[PDB]
Amino acid sequence: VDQATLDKLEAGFKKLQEASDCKSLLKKHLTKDVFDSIKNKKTGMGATLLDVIQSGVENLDSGVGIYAPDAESYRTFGPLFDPIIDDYHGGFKLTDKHPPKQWGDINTLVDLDPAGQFIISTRVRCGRSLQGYPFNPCLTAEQYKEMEEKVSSTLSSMEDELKGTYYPLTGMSKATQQQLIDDHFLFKEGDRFLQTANACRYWPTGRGIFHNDAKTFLVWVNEEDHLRIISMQKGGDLKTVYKRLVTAVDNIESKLPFSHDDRFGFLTFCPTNLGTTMRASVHIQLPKLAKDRKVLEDIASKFNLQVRGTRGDHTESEGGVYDISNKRRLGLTEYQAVREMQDGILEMIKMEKAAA
Numbered sequence: 345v346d347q348a349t350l351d352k353l354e355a356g357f358k359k360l361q362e363a364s365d366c367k368s369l370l371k372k373h374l375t376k377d378v379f380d381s382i383k384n385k386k387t388g389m390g391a392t393l394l395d396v397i398q399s400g401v402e403n404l405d406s407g408v409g410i411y412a413p414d415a416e417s418y419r420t421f422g423p424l425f426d427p428i429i430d431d432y433h434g435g436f437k438l439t440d441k442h443p444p445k446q447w448g449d450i451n452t453l454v455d456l457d458p459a460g461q462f463i464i465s466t467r468v469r470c471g472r473s474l475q476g477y478p479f480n481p482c483l484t485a486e487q488y489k490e491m492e493e494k495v496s497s498t499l500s501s502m503e504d505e506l507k508g509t510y511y512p513l514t515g516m517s518k519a520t521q522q523q524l525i526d527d528h529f530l531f532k533e534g535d536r537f538l539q540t541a542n543a544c545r546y547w548p549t550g551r552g553i554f555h556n557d558a559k560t561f562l563v564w565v566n567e568e569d570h571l572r573i574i575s576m577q578k579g580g581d582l583k584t585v586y587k588r589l590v591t592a593v594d595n596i597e598s599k600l601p602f603s604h605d606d607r608f609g610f611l612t613f614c615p616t617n618l619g620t621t622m623r624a625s626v627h628i629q630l631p632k633l634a635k636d637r638k639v640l641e642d643i644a645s646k647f648n649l650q651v652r653g654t655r656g657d658h659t660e661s662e663g664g665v666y667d668i669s670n671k672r673r674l675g676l677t678e679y680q681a682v683r684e685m686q687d688g689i690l691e692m693i694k695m696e697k698a699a700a
């Protein structure tokens with residue numbers, strides 16, 4: 345690790361301290377003991393501690409603040425990753441290991457809001473990393489193209505309900521892109537947290553989205569993770585949404601080789617997405633409970649749920665529509681993760697109905 349990097353790190357560490365109002369897990373778990381312990385470490389691909397915390401240093405409003413430039417980083421900088429992972433996922437010891445993939449009994453899931461007065465739409469997604477390829481910050485332009493080719497070709501083999509087309513971002517009209525994003529289908533452009541983590545190099549090369557004509561099954565290619573496999577639709581039929589996702593992931597997995605870790609389960613770029621990599625969500629309106637975003641968030645937190653704005657991560661709620669989902673993804677099965685969202689949303693709906 346060169347002197348320049350050390351300077352930026354010491355300065356980075358410095359800045360975090362003087363940020364008396366910073367509430368990121370990076371700030372919380374990067375003690376000087378932790379800091380001095382790994383600051384001189386470097387991975388087999390050159391990833392350094394700066395590559396890990398840079399996003400969190402530059403964006404103090406980060407909730408977490410770190411990313412893994414490569415798989416090795418999870419262990420090389422474990423002293424920082426471990427406590428942050430334990431904290432975020434609500435309990436994941438140094439000795440714990442993520443359980444085997446378990447979709448569970450799909451028949452036990454239910455309709456989330458029969459009368460349809462609160463829920464607008466339901467979505468469940470997973471993330472996957474391609475074996476043979478490192479995470480965004482270590483990828484070259486040629487690798488982005490390679491991966492895009494490999495994934496788009498595999499998806500052309502999907503059949504029946506999952507049959508669809510791949511739409512490259514490179515060459516996509518600004519109007520179409522803007523629509524696909526506004527419709528909540530496509531990942532947005534230029535996320536400051538991802539950018540400062542050097543995860544958006546060579547954009548839009550190798551980036552794109554596959555989706556069936558109904559746009560109920562979609563696959564993001566090369567955004568935050570190599571792949572994001574999504575199932576979504578209007579309403580609250582979580583059962584159908586989940587089943588579609590399960591069908592799609594089982595199928596894609598028999599065709600592509602994905603990185604899985606004995607301890608961390610499926611590997612992803614952000615520590616928040618490890619394990620099941622599952623984020624089950626609903627776009628929902630809860631007039632009484634969501635009078636004050638803070639009150640809604642405190643309520644959601646007790647059900648292990650997370651609140652986001654209508655356009656996703658770090659956005660505001662628009663028209664009273666909130667994105668509420670299971671916060672935890674590692675240390676519990678796929679079934680358990682979707683159930684935390686189902687259970688908490690069913691109850692919050694009950695609380696809203698009983699609110700004055």
Ligand SMILES: Nc1ncnc2c1ncn2[C@@H]1O[C@H](COP(=O)(O)OP(=O)(O)O)[C@@H](O)[C@H]1O
Nearest residue numbers: 465466467528529623625626627654655656657
């Ligand atoms: N339940 C949902 N219904 C419709 N759109 C949703 C829903 N949940 C998330 N989204 C959309 O997914 C997109 C990405 O959001 P983000 O918060 O970054 O989630 P992700 O975990 O998939 O990366 C946004 O356009 C967001 O509005």
Ligand SMILES: [Mg+2]
Nearest residue numbers: 531568656657
């Ligand atoms: Mg996202």
